[PDB]
Symmetry: C2
Subunit: 142 residues, 2 copies
């Protein structure tokens, strides 16, 4: 029962699959959102989401902006996260960034991660767009 508007992302290999399952919001309003359900392999072994998981999730959730806007490959240059509250096993966690500025292909994204009415993380990411790649469904270039 995936929350309305979301569909599962599918990787075959690499780090996204290690930390999945992750979900992306469909095209239109809320498209910039990713989500995940806290599962045992996300946790600290004690029923709570590991903060390292939430940072990895913020990295991907907030960088999603650049993918959608440009369909460029990109790399994190800076990531800053303040942790306000925790997530537990089975929480539906969501993440989104807002694109504030771009200078010479450095995109600054202000971001949040939340689980319902609880804000888990507030922070800022700076991502460097590298070069054009094959567009993916839902991206502007697709």
């Amino acid at each position: 029962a995936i929350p309305e508007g979301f569909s599962q992302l599918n990787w075959s290999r690499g780090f996204g699959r290690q930390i999945g399952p992750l979900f992306e919001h469909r095209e239109g309003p809320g498209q910039a959102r990713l989500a995940f359900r806290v599962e045992e392999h996300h946790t600290n072994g004690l029923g709570n989401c590991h903060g390292g998981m939430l940072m990895s999730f913020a990295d991907m959730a907030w960088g999603r902006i650049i993918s959608l806007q440009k369909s460029y490959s990109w790399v994190t240059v800076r990531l800053m996260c303040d942790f306000l509250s925790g997530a537990k096993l089975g929480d539906w966690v969501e993440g989104e960034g807002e694109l504030i500025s771009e200078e010479d292909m450095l995109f600054t994204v202000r971001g949040r991660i939340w689980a319902g009415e609880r804000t888990l993380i507030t922070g800022t990411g700076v991502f460097k767009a590298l070069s054009a790649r094959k567009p993916r469904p839902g991206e502007l270039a697709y």
Copy 2:
């Protein structure tokens, strides 16, 4: 062939196992260091370590300070990472923090992650120590 001074950390479940294998430095000089070898499940599918992996690794590497000093459970309150260079498949990556200050159980740790002579990440973590837990071998309380 684990680099001299390191032994594999072993988890049975949870997020550390998802992102392993990780290694910890033996007791004595360098004890505060963790390490990992970049494997395919760490990468971006293109031979390079995902930046989200490196942040998760920094979280655990830099918080290791509190574990060693206190054998307290702890939680990340703030994590800030500037990414200077990338790691590739098969690189031996190491991470360590230096404990700068403590106020009322918030421990501020200045940190680095490196692969040989390359610094991958410089940053700062603030960790909140929560309560005593069972000491682990190599920790001060053990």
